Amino acid sequence: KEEAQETRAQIIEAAERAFYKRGVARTTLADIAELAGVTRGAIYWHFNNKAELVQALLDSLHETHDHLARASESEDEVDPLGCMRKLLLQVFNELVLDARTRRINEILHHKCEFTDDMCEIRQQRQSAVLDCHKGITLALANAVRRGQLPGELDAERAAVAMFAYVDGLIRRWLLLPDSVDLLGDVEKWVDTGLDMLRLSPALRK
Amino acid sequence: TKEEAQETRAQIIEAAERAFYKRGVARTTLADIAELAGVTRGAIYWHFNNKAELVQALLDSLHETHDHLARASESEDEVDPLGCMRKLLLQVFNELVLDARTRRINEILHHKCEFTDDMCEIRQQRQSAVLDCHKGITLALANAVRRGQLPGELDAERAAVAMFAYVDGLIRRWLLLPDSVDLLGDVEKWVDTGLDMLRLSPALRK
Ligand SMILES: O=C(N[C@@H](CO)[C@@H](O)c1ccc([N+](=O)[O-])cc1)C(Cl)Cl
Ligand SMILES: O=C(N[C@@H](CO)[C@@H](O)c1ccc([N+](=O)[O-])cc1)C(Cl)Cl
């Protein structure tokens, strides 16, 4: 029950609407609280500040891909590349179909400044990205151990090349959706990225 | 013409950069730049109507340093369009790593500028600019295909979107975590990796 565990989910939903409408920079807890139907104190009970909320939205994105990620990263996975290809297809699908994922991504890329007032936001991002980076490198190592991608493949650099590509593609669809048939052509887009990892000599040390 | 005005504009723009960088585009009024640049408010209004007008000016300063190579790389009469495109991206990354002004505007563009219904002109311009850039990379690519620099069957369109995506994300990665990408030392590698995808990826063909 009680007071309400699910109040925490109600506050997050309102934080999404507020951030999407006014942007993170100019949203205050008061705004969010009025929007949720609660008091600032009810927000303070779940979050110590605005950075914590942003954090929660960020963190929510990882859930849906949890299993597919852990799969690719694991040593005992027979088909590590196959899991990464699967995950990317999910990432792009969730992005195109789920208004929730779209909005949080929109907030993250286009509605969330990095300013000296909440270095917390930029810090959250940095570590979030280094994390994702570590994960990516691990997967690349596994695909190599299994000869799914060329032997002496500079993992670190390919990881960055991957993340960059995917990241910029997401941001591109966000800015101009009707100029990237992301849904229909998911296969191509994902593979374009994947092809780079194996066919590109520049990524080979 | 009056040199007095041309100097005041150059000062508004310099201060906008320093402002937007520290406080961000969202919570920064034009009045704030007036005090920062040491100029009358109405003067900024003479120079720039709304804040979006200024942001636009910052975005613009970026294309100056590359206009030459960009044009060359698009020209149908250009003998080595892929070489041009290569040299251009090299000249983009160098200026990023070396020129603090360029780094700051990109940081503003990527990390300090929100899209809100209040200021929709910022998003519209941002869309306009990327469509501009887009049309650019397509011509260039097509010209490199036409000259057997790339695979004949390449899809210029998608290929352009891919490359831009790759270039845009890398810049951002470096702004967020500079001490990760040795963009200065490995510069040629990063430029090549992107290009390799354009010519080697079978998913980009047809
Ligand atoms: O799913 C995510 N990122 C995708 C799409 O950008 C991708 O970059 C990614 C691929 C593998 C990975 N690894 O399994 O942890 C993490 C992220 C985020 Cl939830 Cl980190
Ligand atoms: O970084 C920039 N442009 C990138 C976009 O990917 C660069 O790759 C580019 C610029 C112009 C261009 N066109 O004019 O030929 C093509 C690519 C500008 Cl914002 Cl300075």
Numbering used by the authors:
A (entry chain B): 6 to 210
B (entry chain A): 5 to 210
Tell me what the authors wrote about this structure, in their words.
TtgR is a multidrug binding repressor that negatively controls the transcription of the ttgABC operon as well as its own expression. TtgR belongs to the TetR family of proteins, which are characterized by a conserved DNA binding domain but variable ligand binding domain. A TtgR monomer consists of nine alpha helices forming two distinct domains. The DNA binding domain consists of α1–α3 (residues 1–53) while the ligand-binding domain consists of α4–α9 (residues 54–210), with an angle of approximately 80° between the two domains.
The structure of TtgR in complex with chloramphenicol was determined using selenomethionine substituted crystals and multiple-wavelength anomalous diffraction (MAD) methods and all subsequent structures were determined by molecular replacement method using the TtgR/chloramphenicol structure without the ligand as a starting model. The structure of TtgR in complex with chloramphenicol was also determined at 2.7 Å resolution. The TtgR structure is almost identical to that of TtgR in complex with tetracycline. Chloramphenicol is situated similarly to tetracycline and utilizes the general hydrophobic environment of the side walls with little specific interactions. We therefore term this site the general binding site, which most probably contributes to the versatility of TtgR's ligand binding property.
